[PDB]
Amino acid sequence: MAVIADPETAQGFRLAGLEGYGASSAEEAQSLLETLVERGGYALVAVDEALLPDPERAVERLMRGRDLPVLLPIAGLKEAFQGHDVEGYMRELVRKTIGFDIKL
Amino acid sequence: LDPWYRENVAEDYPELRDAISELLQREAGLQEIVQLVGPDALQDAERLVIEVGRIIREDFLQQNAYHEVDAYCSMKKAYGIMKMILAFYKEAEAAIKRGVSIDEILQLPVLERIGRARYVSEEEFPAYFEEAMKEIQGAFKAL
Amino acid sequence: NTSNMPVAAREASIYVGVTIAEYFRDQGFSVALMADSTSRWAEALREISSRLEEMPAEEGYPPYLAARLAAFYERAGKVITLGGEEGAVTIVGAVSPPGGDMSEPVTQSTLRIVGAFWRLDASLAFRRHFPAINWNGSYSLFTSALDPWYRENVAEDYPELRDAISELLQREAGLQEIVQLVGPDALQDAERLVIEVGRIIREDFLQQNAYHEVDAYCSMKKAYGIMKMILAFYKEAEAAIKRGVSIDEILQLPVLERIGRARYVSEEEFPAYFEEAMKEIQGAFKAL
Amino acid sequence: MSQVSPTRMNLLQRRGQLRLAQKGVDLLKKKRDALVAEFFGLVREAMEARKALDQRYAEALIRVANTETRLKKIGEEIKKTTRRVNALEQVVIPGIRAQIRFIQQVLEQREREDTFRLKRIKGKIEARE
Amino acid sequence: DRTHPIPDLTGYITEGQIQLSRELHRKGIYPPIDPLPSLSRLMNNGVGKGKTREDHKQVSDQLYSAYANGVDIRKLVAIIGEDALTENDRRYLQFADAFERFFINQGQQNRSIEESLQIAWALLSMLPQGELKRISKDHIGKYY
Amino acid sequence: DRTHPIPDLTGYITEGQIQLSRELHRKGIYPPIDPLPSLSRLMNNGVGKGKTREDHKQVSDQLYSAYANGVDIRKLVAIIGEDALTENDRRYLQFADAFERFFINQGQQNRSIEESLQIAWALLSMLPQGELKRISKDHIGKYY
């Protein structure tokens, strides 16, 4: 697995023994996906969501082969946690399913 | 037949039955959707409509042919029970709009009395309207 | 019974035949009466009846088209002939409805009398499954009547084996109906195994090649031996799945291709396949 | 065709949609299973992550997302393009039985009633003669 | 064809109907009775205290409900796999086999209604007592 | 059954047909007119400048086309889900509701042809102007 995060965090994943790679934009990060994809050995890439706001378009672009890394947007930036990016992820996921923008 | 009811029983007979039927109509639509996406996503507003829709079915539509009282329901009693249910509806929707928990309304003490109203042979039934309003006030008090 | 012949002659043809048939059984012979067909006999009879101005009914057939046909089939049977001795007349009648409708005359009235029906299925034929007899739509009321002959002379497990195969085919039919709706992707390994073995029953057993010098006739002894190879493969298949063996591993099991050509073997080399099946599954219990 | 089409037709139809229905309740059960492993994941996540921010302390970090990242890894995307899977699927499927059901009844309409204007016409020829 | 005019007109002349089905017979279930097309068009008139036994209707209702659920679960097993079935559903799945093996199947044998109710209660024990929605508590205490 | 020989043979005797549908009535749309099965055989002889208004045929054509597309999209919504519908299709979906709510539905009320064309143009505004294939630019500039 690789992790793509802001450079300070990426550094911290490395010190923990994990394979963190640093990026500071949606585009930069997509570049990183493509180098990893071509380079070949990863089964999963966990990406800070601030760096992957459109992960379907992300797959779309990587185009190459061929068998893909699962692509996993995970929380971000600093002020983006000190929300709750959950309450609304949940509003969308239930509408998503049943069809009904329910009054939460 | 609406004019016979309006002139002899109650001025709001037609409006009341149209309102109850719209309630039942809405419940039917809601239950169809719930059959698909489950009931967990339901907003408080939709849970209230099912709550009152259920009271209409159990407290009004259902009648006990075997009970000495509910075997026959006089015209005067039919409208009075309708207004207790419709008044509970308005109060229910009004309380929700003011952030009253539906769970708080669902266990409102008057509800059990509304459920046994079909068994009362005295107008003690229209008294339930005032009993409903004050009880909601006790829910407007606690907030 | 040609077309240039009067309706009268063709009408009488089954009666002339049955009488000759009854004559040979009287000697103590077992005779087979094969009637090509009664649909055409009822058309010849309807022509005679209409010419006689008898009142037409359903499809314009005369009312006396059920009691007569029944009376014919009633003359069938194994008897104790005059002066002791046993003989018999077995009747096999062809059914040709006006066209797929399978109503009147022929079919309808006949299927109500006869105790056995072997349904050749055009879809089974197009699929090259021979004999093209639909094992789901065919029936006999003699299964219990003949089971003891098989148990005593051929195999003690004849009835249990055919009941088990039929339950297999029955289950397949139900599964295929559901798959027709929700697709086959959701199918569990257990259900895929049942379709796998159900298919082997259809291809390796039900289907028989009338044109092959060997499979043109399948002796009783060969029929049970092939049944036990299939049923033994079933038990082993379900047993392997229960132990987390991939169905894909069983589907390409080497013995399967041999089981598929078993109908072509004229030697008992066929029952050897049972042991060949067990060891092969063991080689699958080994690799896990 | 004619008769026989008659009943297998609609039990493909009726018996075959009774069990498309039944995959429908199956998947809202999964609904409630899935959504509850959905929020908790969420939980620790929000969590010591920013325990990461104010940051050895190197793991308040990967310790953090070994926990944090793993949990929401399974849960987060295994947990639903596969959840939103289960249920997004089997419903265009009670679509099958649905409008396609209209199918069997215009089909069936067409002829136990048409086949009858007819058993009766032919009666009618020498029924009338 | 149960809609043929002959069998179809006969239904009105009956107080109880037992409908046999070829499909069921081909699954090896005998007697090949369609449990959703056999009716006590008059069953309630021949059962209860002073006729059979007071718990007869409750037991019949519970067995019918449990067998119908068990048969649907055979479909669910095919859809999801045996191991993915809940513990509660597994009991209903198993009850359908028990109903077929022990209640439907008779080794030719003249069962009294008392014998038939006893087998019914014996198989019902396979279900959680908390899942006997169609048997009043009075009967559970007295007969379970 | 609109194919029954009686109603079916009557169609040829008409210059205008208004077809009512139970399905539409059950959705609460009254009058329950099927907007894709009501026709004016001789309609062109009673419309245009000096009769109704010059834009009448264009407006009628555009409303009919948009309502028919909108009704088909109700099917597509059922197939794919509301959220998977394109922005353009969503407008046509919404137009079908607007046509039913505002144009078909009348609160009993005698609308002049001028009133009816005005409602027609008002609902047409819901559609992208670039999607008005059946209205010449001369009419869009003058009447939109």
From Swiss-Prot, chain A:
Keywords: ATP synthesis, Hydrogen ion transport, Ion transport, Transport
Annotated family: Belongs to the V-ATPase F subunit family.
Family annotation (Gene3D superfamilies): 6.10.140.810, ATPase, V1 complex, subunit F (3.40.50.10580)
Function, as annotated: Produces ATP from ADP in the presence of a proton gradient across the membrane.
Keyword Lipid biosynthesis: no
Superkingdom, natural source: Bacteria
Name of the protein in question: V-type ATP synthase subunit F
Cross-referenced HAMAP family: ATP_synth_F_arch (MF_00312)
Any matching Pfam family: ATP-synt_F
Record gene name: atpF
GO molecular function: ATP binding; proton-transporting ATP synthase activity, rotational mechanism; proton-transporting ATPase activity, rotational mechanism
Biological process terms in GO annotation: proton motive force-driven plasma membrane ATP synthesis
Curated annotation (Swiss-Prot), chain C:
Domain of life: Bacteria
Protein purpose: Produces ATP from ADP in the presence of a proton gradient across the membrane. The V-type alpha chain is a catalytic subunit.
Stated family: Belongs to the ATPase alpha/beta chains family.
Protein's recorded name: V-type ATP synthase alpha chain
UniProtKB/Swiss-Prot annotation, chain D:
GO BP terms, alphabetized: proton motive force-driven plasma membrane ATP synthesis
Keyword flag Coiled coil: no
Pfam families named in the record: ATP-synt_D
MF terms (GO), sorted A to Z: ATP binding; proton-transporting ATP synthase activity, rotational mechanism; proton-transporting ATPase activity, rotational mechanism
Transport recorded as keyword: yes
Keywords: ATP synthesis, Hydrogen ion transport, Ion transport, Transport
Purpose of the protein: Produces ATP from ADP in the presence of a proton gradient across the membrane.
Family, as annotated: Belongs to the V-ATPase D subunit family.
NCBIfam families, A to Z: V_ATPase_subD
Name assigned to this protein: V-type ATP synthase subunit D
The species this protein was found in: Thermus thermophilus (strain ATCC 27634 / DSM 579 / HB8)
From Swiss-Prot, chains E, F:
Functional description taken from the UniProt entry: Produces ATP from ADP in the presence of a proton gradient across the membrane. The V-type beta chain is a regulatory subunit.
Family per record: Belongs to the ATPase alpha/beta chains family.
Protein name: V-type ATP synthase beta chain
Organism of this sequence: Thermus thermophilus (strain ATCC 27634 / DSM 579 / HB8)
Whole sequence portion shown: 320 to 463 of 478
